[PDB]
Each structure stands twice: as C-alpha cells, then as structure tokens.
Design a protein around this ligand. Sequence first.
Ligand SMILES: [Ca+2]
Lengths: 273, 273, 57, 43, 43, 43, 255, 236, 59, 59
Amino acid sequence: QTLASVSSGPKHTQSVPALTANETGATLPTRPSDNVETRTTYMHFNGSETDVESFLGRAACVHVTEIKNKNAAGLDNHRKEGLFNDWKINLSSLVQLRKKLELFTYVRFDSEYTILATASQPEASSYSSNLTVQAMYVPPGAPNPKEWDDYTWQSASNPSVFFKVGETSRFSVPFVGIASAYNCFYDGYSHDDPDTPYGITVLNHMGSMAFRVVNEHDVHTTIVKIRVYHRAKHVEAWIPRAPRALPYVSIGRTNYPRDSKTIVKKRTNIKTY
Amino acid sequence: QTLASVSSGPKHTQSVPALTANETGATLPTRPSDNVETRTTYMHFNGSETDVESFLGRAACVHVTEIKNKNAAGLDNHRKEGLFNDWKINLSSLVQLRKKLELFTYVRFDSEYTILATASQPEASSYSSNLTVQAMYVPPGAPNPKEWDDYTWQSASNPSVFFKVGETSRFSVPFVGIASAYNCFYDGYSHDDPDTPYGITVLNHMGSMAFRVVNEHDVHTTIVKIRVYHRAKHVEAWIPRAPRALPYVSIGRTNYPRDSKTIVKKRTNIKTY
Amino acid sequence: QTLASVSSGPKHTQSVPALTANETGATLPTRPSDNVETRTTYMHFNGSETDVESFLG
Amino acid sequence: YTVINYYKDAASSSSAGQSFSMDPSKFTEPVKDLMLKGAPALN
Amino acid sequence: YTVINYYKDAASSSSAGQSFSMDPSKFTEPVKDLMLKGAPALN
Amino acid sequence: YTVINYYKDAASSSSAGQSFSMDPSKFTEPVKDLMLKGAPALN
Amino acid sequence: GYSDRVQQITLGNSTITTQEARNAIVCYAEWPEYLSDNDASDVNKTSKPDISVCRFYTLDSKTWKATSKGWCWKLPDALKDMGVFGQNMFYHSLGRTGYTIHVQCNATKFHSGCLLVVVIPEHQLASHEGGTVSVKYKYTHPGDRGIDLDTVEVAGGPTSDAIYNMDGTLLGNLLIFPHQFINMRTNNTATIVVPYINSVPIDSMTRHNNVSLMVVPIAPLNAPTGSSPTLPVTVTIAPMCTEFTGIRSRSIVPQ
Amino acid sequence: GLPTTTLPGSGQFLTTDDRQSPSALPSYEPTPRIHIPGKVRNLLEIIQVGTLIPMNNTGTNDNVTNYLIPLHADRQNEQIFGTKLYIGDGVFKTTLLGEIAQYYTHWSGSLRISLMYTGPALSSAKIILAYTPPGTRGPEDKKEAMLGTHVVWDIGLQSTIVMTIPWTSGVQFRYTDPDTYTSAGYLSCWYLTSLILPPQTSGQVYLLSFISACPDFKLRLMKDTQTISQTDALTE
Amino acid sequence: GLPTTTLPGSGQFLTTDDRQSPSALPSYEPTPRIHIPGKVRNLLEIIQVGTLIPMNNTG
Amino acid sequence: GLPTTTLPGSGQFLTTDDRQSPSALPSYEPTPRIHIPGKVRNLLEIIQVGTLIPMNNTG
Ligand SMILES: [Ca+2]
C-alpha cells in the first residue's frame, strides 16, 4: 500500500501551497490536501500499462503491399507487372503508430515482425492456389532483385523467410541503428548543400524488404496481399514532445496541410458548459 | 572493456613507427596513435558476425530443379519426361555461396539441408493436387533409378525423406569427405594421364540426390519445382585466398570469360575525388 | 586411441606368420606388420555403422 | 510464472519488465534553485 | 544428450546402442586346439 | 539460455560458438626474424 | 652487429648467402616437420633420404625484360629431374615435403623495378579456352621450365593473364598468400619457407602440385642509361623434411 | 498428451535460424582431422593484411599498371593522387578489404595506408600524404591538404610509409554502400619537395599503395554482395 | 516423440501477445548506448507537466 | 497451454531417423530368449573370415 491521499484537516498558515509562479517553468506536485480537507485512501495501482514498454509493446500494422503470380512470359517489367515488390522499411507511413512513436524524440528498441499474406482470385479460376511467399531482407548495398527469379533470391547472405499464403511469419530483429538510438526527428541535412533534402536521415534506416511468390504460374492469376506488423521490444525512449495535432501528409516530414485551420473545437461562449 | 584507442600525446623520437619495409611481406599492426595524438575509447565490440561459423552459417540456395507428375503410360524415358530427376550435389553451381566458400582453400563442416517443393499447374486443371515427394540420397555405387517407380525407390539402405509439396524437409548430414577437409581448390588430376580432367576431384563428392512424386497421376499434369538450401554447421576453414573477381562459367573450374576485361572501375584522372 | 598398426622392423626368424594351413578351417588375424616393416597409426574409428542395429535399423 | 530463453540472441526475448524508476521531476521541476511547495515561489 | 521414454512398452523405445563386444573368433578361429600365428599350423 | 541435444549424432546439433582465438599474425607477420614496430624494418 | 640483411642458409652440402635480404617468410607461421603418428593413415614405413634430397637445387635462369609479365613454377613438379629427389619422386607411390625457396635478382643503385614473389597453395589454373575445358596435364607439368606468362597461349593450356592470377582473381589480392617483394632499391633476394599444406597426410607427388611459386614483375624494370635493358632472375629451391612411401617400380607419366 | 498452442511463424523457413535436425546418416564416423596450417577463425583476421590498391584507375581494361602510381621528377607543389574514402566503392571495391566489407552493411574503425617506393636507391624525395575528414571538398592544393591529418614522408632505406586514418566520425558506424551522411572524407598525395633522380636515370618512378584495416575495425549486418551475379545456373 | 495436443487458438496472431521469436540477424552487435538526458519510462511521468488549455474556444 | 513453434521438416518421414512410437500391442509379452550359438554383432566381424575368390574369371 502506497497512499493516494492522506487525512488532512483545516488550515490557517503562512505556508500557501495554492500560490506559485509558472514563470519559473516548473509544475509543483500539489495534491488535493493542499487546498481541501481530505481522507486517507490507497493507490491500489502501480502504473504498468503506461510504461513505454507497454505503450509501444503491441503489434501495429506498418505496411500493406501486393504481389501476384501470373505467367511472366513476355513481361519485360516484373516489378510493374507485380511479380515482386519492395518496401523501404519505415514506421511513418501508417499514422496510428507514427503518432505514438513521435511522442518522443529518440527511440531505441528491438523489432518483432509478423508478416501476414492473404490471397484472392478476383476472376474466374477453378481453384485457389496454395502459394509460398519469400520475404528477403535487403540491406543497403546488397544487389536488388530485378526479375522475380533472379540470382538475388538465392539470398546466400541476406536473411529470408519462406511461408505460406494464409499463414504468418514471425521473427525478431535487433536495434539496427548506426547511432545509439533512432531519430523520430532530425533537424539537419546529409551534407551542407543548398538542395539536399531535410529531416530524412540514414539515421532511421531499417532496410528494404523484397517480396515474391516462389511458385510458378497456374492458369489463373492469384493476388497476394502482404501486411507487415511491427512490435517494439526492449524499449528506451528519450525527450518527450508535443503530440501531433495536424494530419500527416508525407513520410519523414513534419509537413502539414495548409488548409487545416481548426484542430481545436469551438464554442460560441467561453461561459457555456 | 577492451581499448579501441589509448590516450597518446606529442612525439619526437628515434622510434619511427610510420616507416617500414613492405618488401618483407609483413603488415605491422600500426594504430592511429602511432601517427596522431589520440584519446582513449572502447571497442564495445567482440566480432561475432565475422566468425566463419557466422559467415557460412546461414542457408543459401544451392540448386533448383523440376519434376512432374503425369501419366507415365507409353513413356519410354521417365527421366526425360521429367518423372524423376537427379542432382549431383555440388556447391559451386549457384555463385552467391560459391564466392563465399572460395574465400578459403580447404573447408570442413556439417550440412543442414532444407528442401522446399512448390507446385504449379500451368494448364487447365480442375484442382490443385496434393503431392508427396521422395528425396533419395544416392551414394556413389548405389543403383541408379531408371523409372519413377523402380526397385531403387525401395531405398532399403539409402536415406530418403518423404514430404509434401508446399511443405519443407530438413535434415543434417555429417562431413562426408574421404579426406580431412573439402577442397575448394585442387591443382591436380585423378591420375597421370594426358587427357583426364583437372580440378574436379572425388575429394569434393557429397553425393547425388534423386527426386520423384510418389503419387500416381491425375487428369492434369502437375509441375513440382524443388529448391535445395544448404547451411554449414560446425565450420573449419584453412588458407585464405584472393576473392573471385571474374564471372564464373563452369562448375568446379576456375575458368573465366575471355572477353571480360574491365573488373576495376575506371576514372580519367588519378587526381579526381 | 586404439592402434591400427604398430612400428615393426626387419625380421629373420623361425617364427613364420606368413605360412599357415587353411585346411584347418581357420583364418588367423595376420596384420601387415607380419610381412612388412610398418609405422604406428591409430584406428580413429569404432565401427558404429556396421553394428547390426545400424545395418537393419 | 516461468520463462527460459530458447534462443541465443538477446533480441529474441519477450518484453522487458516495468521500469519502477519513474521520476517526473526532470520534466516537472528542472529548476536550478530548489523550490519548495508552500514557500514563496519568488522571494 | 538426453532421452526419456514416453511410453510404457519396451518395444516403443528407439534404437539400442553399439554392442562393443565384437568377437570375430567364433567365426575366424573355431578350432578345437589353439593355433598360434607364427608357429607351425600343423606339427 | 538453455539447450539440450535431442539427437544422438553430433552433426544434428546447432551452430558452434565464437572462436575467441583470433590471431591475424600467421597472416600479417609470418616473418622468421621478429620485427618490432618502431625499430628499423631492415638494419 | 648482425643484420636482418646478411644471411646464410646451409642445407645438406649447399650453402646460400645473401647480403641484401629483407627478412624471410615462414608460411602461416609454421616450420616444416615430418608426418606424425596421430596424423598418419598409411601403415607403411616412410623413407627419409635426408641430406641427399634436402639440399638446394637451382632452376634454369629467367630473363627479366622491361616487358616481362611473370613466371610460374609448380611444386613438386619443378624439381622432378633434380638428382636423387626426382628419382625418389618416381619410385614411390606417395611423398611429402616442404621447401626453402630462394629467389635471386641483383642489380644497380641506378635501377628500379619491383618483383612480387608469392607461394600459392592449390593454384588451380584457368584454361585458355574457358568454358568446361581443362588445362592439360602437360601444361601444368612443365618441369624446371615453368610457365612463362608472356608466351603465346595454346589450346588446352592456361591463360597468360598476370592481372587475373591465371585463375579469375585479381593480382593485388595475391598479398593474402605468403609473399615477399624484391625491390631493387632495397632487396636483392626473397626467401620463403613452406611447410606441407594439404587435406591428406601424404599424397601423390605426380598427379598433384601442392603449390606454385610465382614471380611477377609489378614495377617495370628500368635500367640506367646505357646499361643493359635486362636482368636475370634465378630460383634456388631446397626440399625440407622429405618423406617417401609406397615404393615400387617407376611411376609412368605422360610424354 | 501435453496441451500446447502453436504460434505465428509456425512452419516458416528462415534461412538465418539455428536449430537441431536429425542426421540423415546416423552412426557415421567422419574422417579424423589432420593438422593444416593457416586456420581462419574470423574475417577480421584477414582484412588486417594489406593488399594493393588499383589507384591508377585510368584506362579501359584492367592491367598491372593500375597498381602503379606515377611519380615525376623535378615537379614541385604538384598533386600525385586523390580519391574519396568509399571502401565499398571506387578504387577500394576490388581490394581484399573492400571485397569483404561488401558482405557487411556497417563499418567502423581506422584504416591503414602504406606507400612503398620503388624508384632507384640513388634518388630522393619528400612526399605528403593527407586525410581530409568529412565536411568539405577535397583539398585543391597542398596548403589546404596539410591542414588535416597528414604524414610527411622522407624516402630512404625504409621503403614504406604507413599512415593510419583514425576513426574521425560523429556517428559510430558508417555504411559500406556509398551514402552521403556517412562519408569518410578524402585522401590525397602531393610533393613536399620533389623527386630527384641521379645522373643516368630517367622516366617515371612508381609507388605501390596498400590498404588494410587496423585492430580498431568492426563490420556488422551481413548481406549479399554486388561483386558477383549470374544469369543462369552453371553446369559441369 | 513426445505426445501433445494442440489447443483452440493455435496459429492465431493476437497483436497483443508477448513471446520469443528467432532473431533474423543472429550474432549481430547493436551500437553501444550513450547517455542521453530526458529518459521517459512511464506516460504518467509527463502528464504531471502542466500545458496550456485553449479555454477561449471561441472562434 | 504451452506456446510452441513448429520447424521446417515438421511431418517429414526420413527413413533414417530413430524415435519412439506407441506400441500397437500394449502389454504383450515376447517369447523368452534361448541361447543360440553364432551371434553376430557387427559386420566387421564376418569380413575377417576368408572366402574363395573366383580368380579364374575366364569362361
Ligand atoms: Ca474445383
């Protein structure tokens, strides 16, 4: 038992806790017993669910993509045809999690990736194909796939997972930052150039993931949609910031819509209840 | 804590570590503190990921083959028809892993084989057949399959695995070399003959693997593709060599394309940045 | 370590292991050191794979 | 309850426990000179 | 390495170990009178 | 973390640990007479 | 008073001397030694001729021209006609040995040029043709002559590409192998002690070369004005800790 | 009949996992190990060995002359060579260090550059080797260059000069793949005095440069290289 | 070959579970942590900080 | 309800594995062993016995 409130009686002192000076920049821990006669009560509470481990410890969808399985004969752009796809791992494309991460400035953690692949056959097909997807972790510098069945899929040194459509794949990934933490924000540039981008840093690089169906083609086309979920484990977060108020518009940019002008709800009278 | 660098101040000695003699064939471990005033810093690093166990400890694709399941009635060459196939286990057909192995001269390890079999029905079929593949380990000297359902598949003494298409098979294999290690290179011949091959030695033999679908035939044909992955465990490697620069052209031969003449990137001026 | 072969030198004895009598129905365990000068070497082998449990296992 | 790690890498393990070392002060009273509730904020 | 039997019947258990009690003699020297390598096979 | 081998054969086991017995010298200083950094390479 | 530069190597009834050395390399930090019982397989007794084979044999000289590409010798092949060593090498089914390789090239404080002297364990050569064509036995078994890299390529022989190490790898990375340089301004010679390196305890000395000594000009030879534009290159080699086994009738090889 | 629950990922084949599996050859006895010199335990062992840099990148075809840095007599204040410090690219890409660095994603550590003089014994020279940390342009002259990490080389008996490139960085790891934020600076060479040849001598003299890593070095996040590929599987 | 019985829920992906999984990058060494002021452990830490209320909601 | 993860190879039938299985005849009592001369334990036992070589291969 920790006390939520203590028994407190009347006052008539020179010690006035009700008065302070917010000019100082401080917020003194006043308690109701500083301005009211109180009774003893117990916290009966530890605050587990608000620990940052908790707060960022659940899987959230961070990306949805699509691939296909057709007959690649005569097709000159496998990527455009949808025979394989990429994903430049980033956690700011889907907004639900992005607002959570951004509550802090620097963030360090391990990742638990769960990949779901569901299939659909939108047009006339005799049966539903049982496909196998390959997910390849392509670190910057490794050769990029160009065709759905390149030498690249050999993946001799790049980690890859093979799993069935309808199933799910799960693996953990260590904190892969080149610095001591990930930058939720970065008020800088890659080099002092007049035209180089701002904010986006390799200091947030987590990689690129490549996807494909390992099977050949049937008579029909099968559409595979991939959903990537991320869960943060072994979390560390520094420097809390102001919540995001305006809509997001772009990945890795604090840019906000210019026609968004009413985030705060309005009344008519400051006196109404 | 191991030191990455020590604190080091100005110098004016007769002890000149900046000067040496590369004629000797040695590379002395100079450190930045031999030519610069330094500060103390810590390694904060052990070098786990560069251990050869690590380097060769991940699965890499070492072969892709295909088999089928039709009606073998009237077919006189089951092998050509694709009712069963072979594979003379070798780790130099796919280049990604081959360049890694060849960084060393002799190499000793255990193998962890993972076999994936995916199916495809390229032409009009009512449903997708659920097939079972048999993978037989055929040591040199054992009788070779001739038909898809020979007495050979009885496999009374040859190890074999049965698994379903869409699934995967995994087993380990002990170091099966007749010598103390595997030869990544061999500057020799089988016997002193003027016409016998060069390089290729039974000293690299790992075997031959036979594949087939155990099921009979349906009304349609089913195409099964087999991908074999190899992972090295309990690794030992001796005598490091120069990396491969030129493209590979043949299995077990150091031969390289004769029209490949520019492996090193060129400038215009040795002075440009 | 079990010995595969022992060091063995020249001979000139009355003890002739190279001669026997197969009429008896026996096969005496001669070793190369009975007819050749040898060096010491180790079995480095137990014979697991030839156990009948293995053979029919 | 019990838990034994089945993997070699530390990343593989499940969630870390509750910090129990909360301290809102770095955020609520980062003042140089200590201010005591009840005494004049500014003298 | 470890192994515990999950079944009641002895038949259910895996393979028996290596015999280590090889003795080719019953097959290679089943002679009544002992013959010594090096001495006259027949005297 | 814990690991017990479920199989009889040594090949069946997972990856071997980190060697921790690195020694670049056999490759970087295979000289007969010892050379000391700081002293004349050739005298 | 002694120097890293002046040295004497006495092996059998031959003594070599150099007054301009640059230390010497002992491959993989290992000195030659005979085969041990723990490592032995073959039950036979090994023959150790000693001082009759473990002495220095001098190969036919080479001529360093300003356009020279390099030279390659294969061991034990290069010493197959060298006195009692070659004899023993063809009467036994198996042999084993290490060597002391001494490469010589003297000049003038006015010359400049640099040779790379390297020993490559298992130097599997690439063919002139490429594809699935193998380098014919006789081309990797030139004997004392060795492989002269600026000779026109023939069908079934190796490539003549020093830049590609005749094997598909680049010249600059040849430094990962025990090597030594012969920098005229400094050097005079290069000495390399080679232990037995193989995946088998003992082997056939005729169907397999364990190493190939390579001498490659890196910095072109540049002689003083009015001086002779060439310099000879001499290679002296001594087998050490030699063992032979499987004696019988003379081995029969192609040619 | 022990109640269980299977988890997400069940049945997946992650090429990078490490578990036990049954041996297909039970009871089999591997050949005994014999001693073999030159055992490699870690890749960090071999990148400490210096190999030649093809600094004379000029040309169209690979040729032994790529490793030779030309030097000219009676030239003063002039520049000998320049290059960026992209170990996964440019002149360092084919070297042993750059070759192995490209199997990993991150790198960190100090580098060793040796320059070996091959000119006549009766010649003389004084050269200046410099390392310009990131943040500016490559030096345009010796004056600009000498303001950074540098070594003045006096050519003599001691044939080679060794300069270490101390880890000069904010972030603790740089990418091997050329990325702007993680660039390592420049490297350049100039005459501090000039090359002087003796009578009866002429032409060009060359320098051989070697690259290797210091014990300082680290490489992480293993990946596939761009230095090898194929269009079809190979056959015998 | 230990007899088991799989339970309802087998194979489900509950975004809120917390279990071990294999590391895709085995043997990898994360960058060392450096000291960084302003560490947040619980959200209850930061809501104790007063922020302005837009009470003049009019407009 | 103990959380598990099934691995590659699950369900395969490798003729060469060695594991436990349920007995189809539980409680059954095998006939007692009687002594029988000529027990063979290893194949290396019998190849030490010499047999005739058909050297006159002619015919
Ligand atoms: Ca149907």
